[PDB]
Design a protein around this ligand. Structure first.
Ligand code: HEM
Ligand SMILES: COc1cc(C=O)ccc1O
Length: 403
């Protein structure tokens, strides 16, 4: 235990979930690599340390403890070597930029219009539940082959998987403090199996253009498929973060723009600024905030800390994206910030595989929203609360407009 960081003993899980930024501002100043007792792990808080650990040849991927309890093996985020190379080759075809550009407009734009048509004449909406989450999950769900799983159910699954994956608190003995918090993750997985096992049964015999059918068949010898137990943990990686994060990124970008009314007006007037607005939104409140980890494979010194081999490090990219060594007043959303590198998609061999897809989903969703409701305003009678330490986003976004 590091004596001058004794204050970290009093940091709680609830504190980090409600707002981790004050603790992490102290960490970036006091100890860019620091052991946080309630998380049971070293955490990297600065951009330099997050990027170094994420790309270091002396580290490899590992899943956080609660993440591993939730996903098992082999989750693409948690493996290396040949298995990782196979799983990357499995997921990459539909995510290739030239491929995304062939069909992303016809996928996302009709979905956005469908959800907008339900409320665009109402004068009020809660955009997280009514727009941002549905567009994110329906787009990816259709791409995967889950057309028949309703968006309400996809949203429920990623919320349960989120809470299980981030159920990270440990007690005085380093044991999980809230073992009951994994139950809803296990229940979500059981429901997912009941729905997806018959789909995999069908795709094995009758492949189609769905991504999960291609995960089963691509690159395999004739008549063979990847075993479903081998692909299910990466299905869960998708049914949590890939389903959740474009909606979080959309919503955080909107909250940021509302906080700068002149900039919201600029973007509505000139939708070519939407990509820049989203990039700033991801830096400003990173959807994947501290869910990623690496483990050292040999003894290494990071930020003055001598780590033995086998030391996990949580990568708190959401804190790295407020590093004041890089950014002026990072807690303010600013569309006109110069476009600098950011870590909201991670870094290294395990960096996000779906960046190009995700950016287009968010872009098209905001384009259609501003076209349908150009006089969109935040409902300032309602507060916007952000929640989450592992994954972070606004829990609601009440808006109003003149009808
Ligand atoms: C704005 C929304 C999104 C954000 C902020 C995002 C951010 C990330 C981050 C931070 C990681 C960890 C990278 C690292 O290890 O350093 C990540 C891994 C990944 N993301 Fe994204 N993601 C986003 C949308 C997606 C979507 C929609 C998909 C799928 C279509 C996607 C597929 C992946 C995969 C497969 C991995 C694991 C890569 C590996 O471990 O090799 N992500 N994402
Ligand atoms: C792309 O989805 C995920 C990413 C991560 C960590 O970066 C953790 C769980 C996920 O489901």
């Amino acid at each position: 235990e590091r004596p001058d960081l004794a204050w970290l003993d009093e940091v709680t899980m609830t504190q980090l979930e409600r707002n981790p930024y004050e603790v992490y501002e102290r960490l970036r100043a006091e100890a860019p690599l620091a052991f946080v007792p309630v998380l049971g792990s070293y955490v990297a808080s600065t951009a330099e340390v997050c990027r170094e650990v994420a790309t270091s040849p002396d580290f490899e991927a590992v899943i956080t403890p609660a993440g591993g309890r939730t996903f098992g093996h082999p989750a693409i985020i948690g493996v290396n070597g040949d298995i990782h190379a196979d799983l990357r080759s499995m997921v990459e075809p539909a995510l290739q930029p030239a491929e995304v550009d062939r069909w992303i407009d016809d996928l996302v734009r009709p979905i956005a219009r469908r959800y907008l048509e339900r409320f665009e004449n109402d004068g009020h909406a809660e955009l997280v539940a009514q727009y941002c989450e549905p567009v994110s999950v329906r787009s990816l769900g259709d791409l995967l082959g889950l057309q028949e799983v309703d968006s309400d159910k996809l949203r429920e699954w990623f919320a349960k998987l989120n809470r299980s994956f981030t159920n990270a608190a440990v007690d005085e003995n380093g044991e999980f403090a809230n073992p009951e918090g994994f139950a809803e993750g296990d229940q979500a997985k059981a429901e997912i199996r009941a729905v997806v096992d018959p789909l995999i049964d069908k795709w094995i015999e009758h492949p189609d253009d769905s991504a999960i059918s291609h995960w089963l068949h691509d690159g395999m010898p004739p008549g063979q498929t990847r075993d479903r137990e081998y692909i299910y943990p990466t299905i869960y990686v998708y049914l949590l973060g890939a389903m959740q994060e474009p909606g979080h990124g959309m919503a955080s970008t909107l909250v940021g723009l509302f906080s700068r009314p002149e900039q919201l007006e600029e973007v509505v007037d000139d939708p070519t600024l939407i990509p820049r607005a989203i990039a700033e939104g991801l830096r400003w409140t990173s959807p994947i905030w501290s869910a990623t980890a690496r483990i050292s494979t040999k003894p290494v010194t990071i930020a003055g800390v001598d780590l033995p081999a086998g030391t996990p490090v949580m990568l708190s990219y959401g804190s790295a994206n407020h590093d004041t060594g890089k950014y002026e007043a990072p807690s303010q959303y600013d569309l006109h910030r110069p476009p600098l590198p950011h870590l909201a998609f991670g870094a290294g061999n395990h960096a996000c595989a779906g960046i190009y897809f995700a950016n287009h989903v968010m872009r098209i969703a905001l384009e259609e929203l501003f076209e349908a409701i150009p006089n969109l305003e935040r409902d300032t009678r309602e507060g916007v609360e952000f929640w989450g330490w592992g994954f972070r986003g606004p829990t609601s976004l009440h808006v109003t407009w003149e009808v």
